[PDB]
């Protein structure tokens, strides 16, 4: 089968930039080679068919060249719609393969992160289980580090965190990362803290509370 | 005009069987490919196989053959995905597509989860504030997908994110939401999380504020 490799994995990039991806192919596809966005929630949407021809509807700023194993996907200067994950598929061969995809973020000045730490509800202690919480609000790059420290001890494996979408007003993003213990863990600790390393922060930030106090 | 409707999403255990189907209209159903296509969660497109539904000419991407059967109801314009034991590794979104040799149409998806889990519904615990403050809610417990969270029954979209749900080990899903709002509105604003999680019919009303000693 035919193995399609797509880079870089993220583009970024600012509105009015020039956007330019690549796929190549395992061997040869000649020129039987499409390009499709998506955005989030949506089906794939065919841009460029047989290497280097628009489909119809799509605007002149996307083109496509290369035939044999090397491809590029050049969008001449990106409008807000552009930002999305670009496919590139080959029509070869049997099996149809796709590529892994190329992201394609919004470029804008770097944020430092606000930081919120969150200490777990009563209501939820009653039960058995602790969810402490920290939030990391409006930062730009989307590459963060969240490290839960309790009583100082570095925390690994016990958290889990999401990200939001880019954000259609600023550009930016938005992390929760949550801190499960059992309730008998939570009770033994004193200080619990996350610590948040990003390109934005001179130095990592730490918000912290000690259990039960005001 | 021509399109491809997918059936609607579906919540799964493992072992179950499942069919989904693909209609097109607009144009004659018997004259064009039908290919399906698998996404799975965080990940990007495969080819799953395809079949010409004249005369149900079927081919499968090798990683699918003897996984799963594609067919086709001629009379009625459909194509369709079968299963006859699912995994929880079958989790996924399918696309159907229309594929012309001489895949400009593609229907808009049929998302597919398979889980051992049983429907249930979240808890909602405060996250507490202690001139921006943040405050919010943490939804946590459920399953299947999705809740849904506003603030002060829609009064309050500004600073809202709502973040995208974690599974957890358990097989329950846990999401947050969270606003933030000037710090001198503590006091005399109020803030209230409504939550629903329309699966398990549970909904849930939480007003948040600053936790006193």
């Known amino acids: 089968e035919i193995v399609l490799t797509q880079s870089p994995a993220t583009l970024s990039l600012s509105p009015g930039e020039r956007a330019t991806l690549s796929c190549r192919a395992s061997?040869?596809?000649?020129?039987?080679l499409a390009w499709y966005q998506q955005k989030p929630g949506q089906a794939p949407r065919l841009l460029i068919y047989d290497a280097s021809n628009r489909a119809t509807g799509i605007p002149a700023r996307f083109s496509g060249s290369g035939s044999g194993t090397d491809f590029t996907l050049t969008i001449s200067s990106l409008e807000p719609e552009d930002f999305a994950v670009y496919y590139c598929?080959?029509?070869?061969?049997?099996?149809?393969?796709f590529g892994q995809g190329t992201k394609v973020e919004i470029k804008r000045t770097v944020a430092a992160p606000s930081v919120f730490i969150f200490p777990p509800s009563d209501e939820q202690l009653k039960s058995g289980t602790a969810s402490v919480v920290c939030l990391l609000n409006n930062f730009y790059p989307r590459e963060a580090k969240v490290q839960w420290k309790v009583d100082n001890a570095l925390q690994s494996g016990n958290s889990q965190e999401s990200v939001t979408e880019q954000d259609s007003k600023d550009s930016t993003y938005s992390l929760s990362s949550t801190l499960t213990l059992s309730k008998a863990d939570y009770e033994k600790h004193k200080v619990y803290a996350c610590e948040v390393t990003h390109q934005g922060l001179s130095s990592p930030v730490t918000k912290s509370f000690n259990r039960g106090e005001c | 005009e021509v399109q491809l409707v997918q059936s609607g999403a579906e919540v799964k255990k493992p072992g179950e069987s499942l069919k989904i189907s693909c209609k097109g209209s607009?144009?004659?159903?018997?004259?064009?490919?039908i290919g399906w296509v698998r996404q799975m969660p965080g990940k990007g497109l495969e080819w799953m196989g395809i079949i010409y539904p004249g005369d149900s000419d079927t081919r499968y991407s090798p990683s699918f053959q003897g996984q799963v059967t594609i067919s086709a109801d001629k009379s009625i314009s459909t194509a369709y995905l079968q299963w006859s034991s699912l995994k929880a590794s079958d989790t996924a979104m399918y696309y159907c597509?229309?594929?012309?040799?001489?895949?400009?149409?593609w229907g808009q998806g049929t998302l597919v989860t398979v889980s051992s889990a049983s429907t249930k519904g979240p808890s909602v615990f405060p996250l507490a504030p202690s001139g921006t403050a943040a405050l919010g809610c943490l939804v946590k417990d459920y399953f299947p997908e999705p809740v849904t969270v506003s603030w002060n029954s829609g009064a309050l979209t500004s600073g809202v994110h709502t973040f995208p749900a974690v599974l957890q080990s358990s097989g329950l899903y846990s999401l947050s939401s969270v606003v933030t709002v000037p710090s001198s509105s503590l006091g005399t604003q109020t803030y209230i999380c409504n939550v629903n999680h329309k699966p398990s019919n549970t909904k849930v009303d939480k007003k948040v504020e600053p936790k006193s000693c």
């Open positions: 607009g144009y004659s159903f018997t004259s064009y490919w």
């Open positions: 597509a229309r594929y012309d040799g001489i895949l400009d149409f």
């Open positions: 061997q040869s596809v000649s020129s039987y």
């Open positions: 598929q080959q029509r070869s061969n049997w099996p149809l393969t």
